[PDB]
Amino acid sequence: MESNNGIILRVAEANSTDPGMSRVRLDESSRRLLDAEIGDVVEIEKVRKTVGRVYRARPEDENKGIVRIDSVMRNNCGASIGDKVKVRKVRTEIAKKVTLAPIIRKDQRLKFGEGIEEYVQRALIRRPMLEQDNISVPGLTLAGQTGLLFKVVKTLPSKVPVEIGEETKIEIREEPASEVLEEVSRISYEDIGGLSEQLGKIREMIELPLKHPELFERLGITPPKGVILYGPPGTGKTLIARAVANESGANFLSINGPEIMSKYYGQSEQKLREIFSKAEETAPSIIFIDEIDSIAPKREEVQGEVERRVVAQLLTLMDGMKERGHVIVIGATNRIDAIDPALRRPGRFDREIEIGVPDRNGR
């Protein structure tokens, strides 16, 4: 369960992408616990000693034992869902003059322009925040856009978390800023459309071993080796995979089926031998092949020993893993009927997942 209750709560991903960045939604019952007004400014303290202030809002569908929260603060904090969080009411401190600059990675240092009053003044309305934080203003048109990343070097009042009001002066320098905080392009569970039941089901499998293996392996369950995904690929498969890896904190290792087939004796096996070699250090990590059906479709009626040696090389590498520094190999294909069942047994993927397609609700 996600249960934690009272003035102290537990952090749970918001069940809606939410309109706002500072929206942290709590039920009437949950609000009565801390005794605060809807939309109140409350500074929440959490693990790692990282703090933030947010607005309260409401579903009617929540349980008082959780907190539906933005991905901004969780990313700024770097939180993995399931942490016990400490929240309390605090009166508002407000900025006077605020300086903002975008992060290095997102822009590449190629970006400059106008819109100080278009972005910030429109985002100048009622944003509670922590000083030294990456604040995001979305809008305009999509398909190149996920948020707009502004890192805070300074706020005229210093060493205080402050809400952004209408009386503050704003600045956009467009010069260097700290890149420490991730680009939202690096995924968040919110970026997965729907599939709430499938999200948690898959997540609990990889998460618990990847979090603390020393019981969930030792005193419980057993760690599996890999997971295969089904349904139309290229849409959620590549996204969900990195959406499992980034949030769990486990490093992500990219593979390409066609690149391996594009290669041959040597580099083909070197690569698969090179990746896992790199995985040992980053282990525990997430290993992923979207293309599983391309490299190992074999139903008998393929030909060469090169394709049989590399796929058989993959067979060896699976069993060669210790399940101690355990790493998880993920896979995806359009249909299970096409792929090879010799990859379906223990020693390797024994775990298969079926992902359907959205509906009027899923969309």
Add this chain to the structure above:
Amino acid sequence: KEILMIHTRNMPLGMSEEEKNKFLEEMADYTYGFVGADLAALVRESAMNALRRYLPEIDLDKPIPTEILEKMVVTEDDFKNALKSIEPSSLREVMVEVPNVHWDDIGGLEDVKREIKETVELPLLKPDVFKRLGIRPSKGFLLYGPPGVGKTLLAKAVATESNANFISIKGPEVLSKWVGESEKAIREIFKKAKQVAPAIVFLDEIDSIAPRRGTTSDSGVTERIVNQLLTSLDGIEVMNGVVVIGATNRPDIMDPALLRAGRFDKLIYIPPPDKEARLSILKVHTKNMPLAPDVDLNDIAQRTEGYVGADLENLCREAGMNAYRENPDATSVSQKNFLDALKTIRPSVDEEVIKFYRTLSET
């Protein structure tokens, strides 16, 4: 031309006061087998074309008269005889080329052609701005419709418009290179275009790769070319100034996984022309050739309906032979010539292929 002139620097024929067929550009249009020094050999072959006519008919010996060195010249024909004499060497491949095709040379249809403005040209000029707008247009489109009709010329049109040299990859071009297992080089052509960027990579009649090979031992049931195309897409992006352009007669039969969105996104249909476009494309052909308006260009448009651009570009081209003008078999342009051509030209007798497009394109 700048290398040849160095061998014109080695000849006292004269140039830019002599302007004539001997102008080095017009002769440079004939030859790709060669490079700088091969031209030196060529002018030596041309210079030798001279000596073989001159010196033998003189029957020279240790005495060399001065008059010959004076009265002797180097004509334009010996170059042709040197150009028709060939020793092709330079690497087997297709090379970048800049055509003259443009909106002026395409009668076509403004509706589908106009979409090419925003599809290609705009992404070319402003790849950094769409980031500001927060937009990432597609990676390429796919043309399908009646065979011929100039669908190949449509890309040569945006080629000169894009102000970038052009490469056309056609099915037969891959097959000849495929026998040598050079498909890896076919992929290198794309990395080559990148080093030459901006440049346009045009995949033509890509449905022409599979038909001859059925299903045989390629990468397995899916082609290695498909494997090369999948990897070809790994390198490029919407960021690069290089543009992928699909053109296909049958954008179904092969392996739709590669035709899947994210690989080739936009599905664009080339419809057959109509009375007006039939007339416009007709006016473009007849303006170059001498015209006696005994025909009524609207009347021969009455006769003509259901004729694709291929038949028209061929009909415009085919009736030209039946008509004779500036020689003494002459018969001027008349409805009789276009009347006899009406029987020679094959109409569109298959509405099947037409309805597969319309039904599939609509829903």
